[PDB]
Amino acid sequence: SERRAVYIGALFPMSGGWPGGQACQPAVEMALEDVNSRRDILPDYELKLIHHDSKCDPGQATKYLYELLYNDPIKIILMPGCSSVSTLVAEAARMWNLIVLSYGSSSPALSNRQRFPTFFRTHPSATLHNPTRVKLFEKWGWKKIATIQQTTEVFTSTLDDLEERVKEAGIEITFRQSFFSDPAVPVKNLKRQDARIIVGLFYETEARKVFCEVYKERLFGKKYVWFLIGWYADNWFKIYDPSINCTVDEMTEAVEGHITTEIVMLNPANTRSISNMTSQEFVEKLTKRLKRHPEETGGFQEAPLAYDAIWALALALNKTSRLEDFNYNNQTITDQIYRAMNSSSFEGVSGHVVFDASGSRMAWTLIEQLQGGSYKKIGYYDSTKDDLSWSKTDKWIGGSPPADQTLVIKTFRFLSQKLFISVSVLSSLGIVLAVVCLSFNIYNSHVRYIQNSQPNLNNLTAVGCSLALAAVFPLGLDGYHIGRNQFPFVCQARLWLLGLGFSLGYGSMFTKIWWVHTVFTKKRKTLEPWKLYATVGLLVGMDVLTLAIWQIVDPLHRTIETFAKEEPKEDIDVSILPQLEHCSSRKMNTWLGIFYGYKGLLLLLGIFLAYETKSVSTEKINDHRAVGMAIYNVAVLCLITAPVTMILSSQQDAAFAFASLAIVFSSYITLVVLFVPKMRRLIT
Amino acid sequence: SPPLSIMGLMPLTKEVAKGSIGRGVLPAVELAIEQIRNESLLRPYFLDLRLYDTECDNAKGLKAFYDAIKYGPNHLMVFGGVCPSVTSIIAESLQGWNLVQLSFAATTPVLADKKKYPYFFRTVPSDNAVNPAILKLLKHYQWKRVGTLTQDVQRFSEVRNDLTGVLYGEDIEISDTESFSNDPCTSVKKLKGNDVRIILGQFDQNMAAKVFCCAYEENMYGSKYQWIIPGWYEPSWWEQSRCLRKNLLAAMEGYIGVDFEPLSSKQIKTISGKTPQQYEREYNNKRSGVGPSKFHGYAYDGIWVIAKTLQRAMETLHASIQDFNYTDHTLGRIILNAMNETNFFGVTGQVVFRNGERMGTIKFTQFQDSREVKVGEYNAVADTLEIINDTIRFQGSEPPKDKTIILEQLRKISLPLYSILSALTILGMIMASAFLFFNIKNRNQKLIKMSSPYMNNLIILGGMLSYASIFLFGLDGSFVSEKTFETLCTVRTWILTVGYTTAFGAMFAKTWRVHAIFKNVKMKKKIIKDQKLLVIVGGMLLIDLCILICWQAVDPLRRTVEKYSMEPDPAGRDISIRPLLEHCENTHMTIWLGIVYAYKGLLMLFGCFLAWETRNVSIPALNDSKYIGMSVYNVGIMCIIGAAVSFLTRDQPNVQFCIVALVIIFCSTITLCLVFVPKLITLRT
Ligand SMILES: *[C@@H]1O[C@H](CO[C@@H]2O[C@@H](C)[C@@H](O)[C@@H](O)[C@@H]2O)[C@@H](O[C@@H]2O[C@H](CO)[C@@H](O)[C@H](O)[C@H]2NC(C)=O)[C@H](O)[C@H]1NC(C)=O
Ligand SMILES: *[C@@H]1O[C@H](CO)[C@@H](O[C@@H]2O[C@H](CO)[C@@H](O)[C@H](O)[C@H]2NC(C)=O)[C@H](O)[C@H]1NC(C)=O
Ligand SMILES: *[C@@H]1O[C@H](CO)[C@@H](O[C@@H]2O[C@H](CO)[C@@H](O)[C@H](O)[C@H]2NC(C)=O)[C@H](O)[C@H]1NC(C)=O
Ligand SMILES: *[C@@H]1O[C@H](CO)[C@@H](O[C@@H]2O[C@H](CO)[C@@H](O)[C@H](O)[C@H]2NC(C)=O)[C@H](O)[C@H]1NC(C)=O
Ligand SMILES: *[C@@H]1O[C@H](CO)[C@@H](O)[C@H](O)[C@H]1NC(C)=O
Ligand SMILES: *[C@@H]1O[C@H](CO)[C@@H](O)[C@H](O)[C@H]1NC(C)=O
């Protein structure tokens, strides 16, 4: 014989909140008969099982724990079924120096080694849905992920680990909400926070309610990816529930296209383990021994974990191979069994069975997707090797994975084209005509029709209007010439040049009619030849002090206006924000209003004096009618075009068009009227 | 005598701090057991107690529990347990052997369920026994809105969850439900942003000094807020950082601590026959070597509780110790029946049992700048909240209770300033209607030394209409005895504009005709041309009448109110003040008032420029216009300075009104004064 009966305590919840004991008990009976049937596993000993029901109730469980612990004989390894009973026995196992092995405890708090140093579990915990989730996020580079959970310990203990795991991947979790049984307000908050990818952690009976609510708010569709758990039945969105008013195919349309992360329960291949069996003979033996139906019993999916749960400890005790005399006081046998169980690594019915440093066993997660009314596999994963296998059956909205919301900045285009070029060629014709007429006037300065006294102020007006026709062009467009992004430099240069040019030209224009009104109301001095011209030139040069004061305290700014609404585009989810630019300052509006008022003051003074001295005669007699008509044109032009360039910003056919038409029509028409009677009657 | 065995599960060591609790509660229970040995109380048994050290580690406690079960005699009940986990697991497991657990330090509300724990009882008041107390305290001084502040631990969040369940049904508001973990400073930020009157704190001891230290920085204290804090900390708790007692001490007044009371409040005879004072003297002289715990009252009480329970079960035993293993449950059911209806008076008061709990005495207290003095009690058995008046204090006179209560009023003007201007109202008007009679004296005694017969009459008409408008300007604004007079703002602004254009038209058309006869070359002396000048003034008059109906059409210009909000307090009361100013405009008539002021400026600067010209034109055909330019300059500067100061004001509605009255009584009589002050002086030589 020599059959030393080594006894091992166990526990199987036959009913209650987790009826796993209906399925695990024939499984552990098969596994104990299998290790009995091999002498390689049993050199000298023989494993025996003593067990009691607990219904996942700690009150009965503590009583049964005492009943097995303080009776005879001495047990070594314990086996708790449910989760809370496993926590209770692993908390208190340290005072007897025992090692405990669970097979269903998905408690993520059971990974602690301080409170639980001597505990392992073949069933993986719930935190191994998170590395596959973060790898599925790393495949597509999504950065704004929102989470919603039922207010439960088994989900709040998962999502914080998901946070402190995803923070190393550089993906932020923005909206982290929670509810208990009211699904309306959290999906209201999610619609108001309009997130893209949504992760959920909840059971089936509230899953139906939250999917009725998300059908009602219309938050499914194109840019929405739903991550859920996968241990629901394949029919779960089909059983009639009167708790929600949503219809069945309206629910089916709502649940369409979401990714599920299950976990494996058996060998995906058809190989043979050290147990020398496959999946099919195992399922046949379970249907033989189980008097119930596998479709109606509980714990049938976790039932293959019991087989290698027995087999791992059996191989560990065979590796220890001074064993039949264990007592709870000593520690060396316990440390030897713990060291043998630490290095457990082989191939069993659930695939490769390796424990981590904490005590959990890693496994594979069959990542799937609901694709049109039925579940279908996407692929597999293993955490220890990053071998993200694939099968390419994931349908999408158009084939591509929809991602987080982005934005395109579109710069508001000008019309630097032939419309700009007609303006530029009219400016060039004005420039050539003005400088040619000014050179012709300077090269007539011996003796002429109008004598040498008067039109040197007219020459200075020609210089000023030439500077206006030289400052009309560099107001720019939406970045069109060699070298850009110096827009404050070119705007301040153009503005300073146009200010000095218009100031010079209009001052030397207006001073002649001021002095002919002065000589009309003097009842012929011209006291010094540059007296009147120099004092009106200093009146002009007062304005460059205003320009310098504008340059000292707030010279320049390149602002950005965002006048239009984002996303007017029709098919792509990239929001188009049209932004424009006009060169500005810190507070320029009241400043430009004050400057317009000052120039309007001088211009209305000129337009009143022009009606004043409309009929006179002096030494410079052949100038006043044409000078007055030019004043009458330039005043109404500048006053009719100051507000439409002050208050406008749409430069396409209105702002720059009206401003350029004003300035070039002003200089063009005033010169082509002011030089008709001179050169035509000089050689007429 | 045959013993009745009982088991105590107490920390007896010197390592764990709960060993101090066990060493403090052992003298009271040995005093109770020796008094029970003195009296008969039994027939003819005697009680025995076996102590078992736990240290309230779960594994060690369950191992000692198993050792006591396996090795001790046939126990009947089980007693003790202080740490909540090692009480909770045994109270869950209790239904196996069908025993009863009596605790005196289980202070967790998770033991409230009887579906979880049907065989468990405790005499210590739980943390849920402060929530009706705080309800009665809030209803004693009529509070509605309160703000909570809970540390994110399971016990504090559980009492926060039951806070809503106890306040469901009454006039209570919960605004700021902030629940921080380790940053209380943003919680004080959010609470001051929601400016809630009452703080309902829920945290441990070490967080409290940090809470007060970074609540001093926001100054969330004073005679405006109260602080309801669980005050079961150690005495002189504030000694445990980087802050200072100056920024700690000035926020701990109005600080209300809600604890459970150790003893009774009387010198009354208990079930022992003695008084609480004599019991307390015997307790503190029983051992004289231990710092006294705050649980020995309930420890002394529970012995009499279980003794009365077994005394109430002995007659049902006689209806049958000698017939009870750990397996029987019917005897334990009779034990539950005799235990549940326990009702007598002990050291803590009249003990009851409403589903495993007795209504205790809640001791309110206040830190009165040196210590937390006891201020009030409450018994949930009778639901009456006693208070000790003439002992509580407040930094304010009245106990603050200060919701943010607001008040508003109109902006008033200074009446000794307004009254002298109302006295200057009449003189310009009477001088106007008298100088009009001097002009009719020129009509009645004909010698036409001036212009057209209607011109100075138009000047006097403009002056009278301006002096009526500036009088009825602020009498309708500030003095609100005529309330619907901001509608009459539109009924007086047309009067003011007509007076302005009449006066400046009589200033302007005359000077324009002087310009039109100065720039001629041959001759100009016509009376029909002066008729043309008067109808030319009438043309811009009817143009301004069209502008008047355009002002009626562009906006109603109804009564609007600017609500200027700064909220100070002049005498310490929390009823804040925010003033409001009447505004006649409709805030989109800026284009309208801009074009009206531009109309007036373009019509006004004509004469201001022309005064530079006609300063030497001494035309005797009109016999005037030598000082009229000196008038028009000295009114053209003042009208624009009045408009400039008017638009640069209404920040204070007093200075703007007195300065526009000052410039109006400047201009509207300085025109008449500088048009007549050499006139009658030379006509009365
Ligand atoms: C593991 O069990 C198999 C069971 O194989 C089945 O039963 C056998 C009787 C045979 O008919 C197989 O074809 C069946 O599939 C054992 O299988 C065979 O054993 C023989 C022994 O001589 C060997 O020659 C075959 O190659 C085996 N075939 C296979 C597929 O394994 C096998 O021996 C068992 N292994 C151990 C280590 O026990
Ligand atoms: C179970 O334990 C026994 C020893 O108690 C192992 O038996 C020996 O294992 C070594 C391993 O290197 C082999 O080389 C020997 O041939 C084995 N001898 C015998 C008599 O079996 C046995 O391998 C263990 N079983 C396992 C690991 O499955
Ligand atoms: C197995 O037991 C060892 C006990 O030593 C655990 O600790 C490791 O010990 C080795 C040396 O013995 C060190 O090199 C490692 O660095 C230790 N691990 C860590 C995480 O520091 C070990 O974790 C246990 N588990 C496994 C899977 O080896
Ligand atoms: C168990 O406790 C409850 C709660 O006190 C008891 O109910 C009270 O019973 C008394 C009579 O014994 C009545 O006067 C009270 O009105 C009851 N309370 C209420 C709220 O109605 C109950 O009787 C106890 N049961 C036993 C067997 O003692
Ligand atoms: C939604 O469903 C509820 C039952 O859960 C039902 O009472 C209610 O009338 C439904 N709402 C409708 C039909 O608008
Ligand atoms: C204080 O309260 C007691 C309670 O009865 C009352 O008798 C007493 O008059 C009160 N004293 C004052 C000053 O309010």
Ligand 2 and A296: CB distance under 6 A: no
Pair B186, B363: CB distance under 8 Å: no
Annotate A145-212 with three-state secondary structure.
EEEEEECCHHHHHHHHHHHHHHCCCCCEEEEEEEECCCCHHHHHHHHHCCCCEEEEECCHHHHHHHHH
Burial label for A380, CB within 10 Å (0-12, 13-18, 19+), is: middle
Distances (CA, A) of B247 to A610, B197, B209: 78, 21, 10
The ligand 6 site (C-beta within 6 Å) comprises B 389-390
Put simply, the chain A residues between 495 and 534 with a CB less than 8 A from any chain B CB are: 521
- What burial class does residue A82 get, using C-beta atoms within 10 Å of its C-beta: 0-12 exposed, 13-18 middle, 19+ buried? buried
Residue with tokens 């006609």: B614
Strands A197-201 and A225-229: parallel
Which SS3 state, helix, strand or coil, does residue A118 take? coil
Written as six digits, the tokens of B644 are 């400039």
A313: buried, middle or exposed (CB in 10 Å: 19+, 13-18, 0-12)? buried
Give chain A's radius of gyration (CA, Å).
46
CA angle (B257, B262, B264) in 5-degree steps: 110
Distance B144 CA to ligand 6 centre (A): 26
**Is A608 in Cβ contact with B96 (below 8 Å)?**
no
**Interchain CB contact of A93 with B (< 8 Å):** yes
Cβ separation B92–A60 shorter than 8 A: no
Closest CA to B234 of B206, B274, B211: B206
Residue of chain A whose Cα is closest to the Cα of B66: A66
Burial letters A108-130, b for 16+ CB under 10 A, else e: bebbeeeebebbbbbbbbbbbbb
Are A85 and A58 in contact by the 8 Å Cβ rule? The answer is: yes
Q: What is the largest CA-CA distance in chain B?
A: 153
Report the alpha-carbon distance of residue A684 to residue A55 in Å, rounded.
Answer: 125
Q: Which amino acid type is present at position B23?
A: R
DSSP assignments along B186-208, one per residue = HHHHHHHHTT-SEEEEE--HHHH
CB B372 within 8 A of CB B257: yes
Query: Is A302 part of any known ligand binding site?
Result: yes
Question: Which residue's alpha carbon is at the smallest distance from atom 7 of ligand 6?
Answer: B389
Residue B399 phi, psi (nearest 5): -60, 120
CA distances, A439 to each of A443, A626, B560 (Å): 6, 21, 65
Q: Which of A172, A173, A179, A170 is nearest to A146 (CA)?
A: A173
The identity of residue A644, as a single letter, is V
Are A209 and A243 contacting, i.e. CB atoms less than 8 angstroms apart?
A: yes
Q: Which are the contacts of A625, defined by CB distance < 8 A and separation ≥ 6?
A: none
Indicate yes or no: CB of B63 within 8 angstroms of CB of A521.
no
Which residue shows structure tokens 């008032």?
A: B593
Q: How far apart are CA A613 and CA A628, in angstroms?
A: 9
Residue B340 Cβ inside 6 Å of ligand 4? The answer reads: yes
Place of tokens 């929670």: A178
Residue in the structure block whose two tokens are 């809640």: B362
- Residues 588-647 of chain A whose Cβ lies under 8 A from any Cβ of chain B: 605, 608, 612
The beta-carbon neighbor of A63 closest among B59, B63, B96 is: B96
A83 is in an annotated binding site: yes
Asked whether the beta carbons of A179 and A201 are under 8 A apart, the reply is no
Q: Is A584 in the pocket of ligand 2 (CB under 6 A)?
A: no
C-beta atoms surrounding B114 within 10 Å: 11
Phi first, then psi, for residue A79 (nearest 5°) are -135, 100
Torsion angle in degrees (nearest 10) through CA of A586, A591, A595, A601: 170
Between helix A304-320 and helix A21-36 the angle, nearest 10°, is 40
Is A58 in contact with B70 (Cβ distance < 8 A)? no
> Which long-range contacts (C-beta less than 8 Å, at least 24 apart) are formed by B540-548?
B540/B501, B540/B505, B540/B603, B541/B498, B541/B501, B541/B502, B541/B505, B544/B497, B544/B498, B544/B501, B547/B596, B547/B599, B548/B494, B548/B497, B548/B498
Q: Are the C-beta atoms of A351 and A361 separated by less than 8 Å?
A: no
Short-list B71, B70, B68, CA closest to B52: B68
Task: Give the pair of three-digit tokens for residue B181.
Answer: 């973990």
Question: A51: which strand partners?
Answer: A10
- Ligand 2, atom 2, lies closest to the CA of A318
Instruction: Give the distance from residue A61's alpha carbon to the nearest chain B alpha carbon, in angstroms.
Output: 8
- Gap from CA of A304 to ligand 1 centroid (Å): 22
The length of chain B in residues reads 685
Q: Is A242 on the interface with B (CB under 8 A)?
A: no
Q: B613: which chain A residues are within 8 Å (Cβ-Cβ)? A: 521
Asked whether residue A206 is marked as a ligand-binding residue, the answer is no
Instruction: Choose among A339, A316, A337: nearest CA to A326.
Output: A337
Residues 6+ apart with CB under 8 A from A412: A478, A563, A578, A579, A580, A581
| B59 → closest Cβ in A58, A94, A608 | A94
Prior bond to A73 cis, omega within 30? yes
Interatomic CA distance for residues B509 and B455, integer angstroms: 10
A8 has which bridge partners? A49
Q: Which residues, 6 or more positions from A204, have their beta carbon under 8 angstroms from its beta carbon?
A: A232, A233, A236
**For residues B87 and A50, is the Cβ–Cβ distance under 8 A?**
no
Tokens in use for A432?
Answer: 């050539």
Report how far residue B166's alpha carbon sits from residue A435's, in angstroms, rounded to the nearest whole number.
93
Q: Which CATH number goes with the domain that contains B147?
A: 3.40.50.2300
Q: Which residue has the tokens 């010198």?
A: B267
Residues of chain A contacting residue B60, judged by C-beta atoms under 8 Å apart: 95
**What is the C-alpha separation between A669 and A666, in angstroms, rounded?**
6
Q: Solving technique for this entry?
A: cryo-EM
DSSP A600-615: HHHHHHHHHHHHHTSS
User: Among B104, B107, B152, B151, which Cα is nearest to B127's?
Assistant: B107
**Closest-approaching ligand to the CA atom of A245:** 5
- Residue by residue, DSSP assigns B531-561 as HHHHHHHHHHHHHHHHHHHHHHHH-----EE
Is residue B44 reached through a cis peptide bond, with omega within 30 degrees of 0 on the bond before it?
Answer: yes
Check CB contact under 8 Å for A94 and B62. Answer: no
Closest CA to B530 of B433, B411, B448, B594: B448
Non-local CB neighbours of A447 within 8 Å, separated by 6+ positions: none
**How would you classify residue A416: left for phi > 0, otherwise alpha for psi between -120 and 50, otherwise beta?**
beta
- C-beta separation of A190 from A145 below 8 A: no
Pick from B248, B247, B251, B190: nearest CA to B222: B251
Cβ neighbours of A58 in B, within 8 Å: 89, 92-93
Task: Dump the DSSP string for B27-61.
Answer: HHHHHHHHHHHHS--SSS-EEEEEEEE-TT-HHHH
Ligand 2 neighbour A40 (Cβ under 6 A): yes
The whole-angstrom distance between A184's CA and the closest CA on chain B is 20
For residue B247, give its domain range: 130-260
CA distance A19 to A226: 30
Contacts of A437 (CB under 8 A, 6+ apart): A462, A671, A675
Residue B31 has phi, psi (to 5 degrees) of -65, -40
| Three-state secondary structure call for residue B263 | coil
Q: Which residues of A574-608 are buried (b: 16+ CB within 10 A; e: fewer)?
A: ebebbebbebbbeebeebeeebbeebeeebeebbe
For residue B388, the CA-to-ligand 6 centroid distance in Å is 8
What residues contact residue B462 under an 8 Å CB cut-off, 6+ apart? Answer: B499, B500, B502, B503, B504, B506, B668
Residue A422 C-beta-side C-alpha neighbours within 13 Å: 7
Do residues B107 and B365 make contact, with C-beta atoms less than 8 angstroms apart? no
Q: Which residues of B make CB contacts under 8 Å with A? A: 58-60, 62-63, 66, 69-70, 89, 92-97, 519, 609, 613
> β-strand B349-351 against B344-346: which pairing, if any?
antiparallel
SS3 state at B580: strand
Q: How far is the CA of B205 from the centre of ligand 5 (A)?
A: 49
Q: For residue B452, give the nearest of B532, B541, B544, B542 by alpha carbon.
A: B532
Q: Locate tokens 């089909």: which residue?
A: A238
Angle at A409 between CA A404 and CA A412, to 5 degrees: 150
Cβ neighbour number for residue B224 with a 10 Å cutoff: 17
Alpha-carbon distance of B606 to B629, in angstroms, equals 11
Whole-number Å distance between alpha carbons of B97 and B93: 8
Q: Give the residue, by CA position, lying nearest to ligand 4 atom 14.
A: B341
Task: Please tell me the distance from the alpha carbon of residue A152 to that of residue A171, in angstroms, as a whole number.
Answer: 24
Place of tokens 């049993």: A42
Residue B117 CA, chain-centre distance (Å), reads 44
Q: Does the CA dihedral B410-B416-B421-B427 come out positive or negative?
A: positive
Question: Residue B408 CB: number of other CB atoms within 10 A?
Answer: 13
Taking the CA of residue B135 as centre, how many other CA atoms within 13 Å lie in the half-sphere pointing to its CB? 20
Distance CA B228, CA B134 (A): 9
Q: Which of A62, A69, A92 sits opposite B59 (nearest CB)?
A: A92
Helix (H) or strand (E) holding B148: strand B145-150
Helix (H) or strand (E) holding B346, with range, is strand B344-346
Partner-chain contact B59 A95, CB within 8 Å: yes
CA pair distance B313, B509, nearest whole angstrom = 121
Calculate helix-pair angle for B131-140, B154-167, nearest 10 degrees.
50
> Best of A52, A63, A152 to disrupt the B interface by mutation (most B CBs within 10 Å)?
A63
Please name which of A485, A527, A510 lies closest in space to residue A609, comparing C-alpha atoms. A510
Strands A375-379 and A406-411: unpaired
Q: How far is CA B578 from the centre of its chain?
A: 15
d(CA B283, CA B635): 99
Burial (CB < 10 A; 0-12, 13-18, 19+), residue A323, is middle
Task: Tell me the shortest Cα–Cα distance from A520 to chain B, in angstroms.
Answer: 10
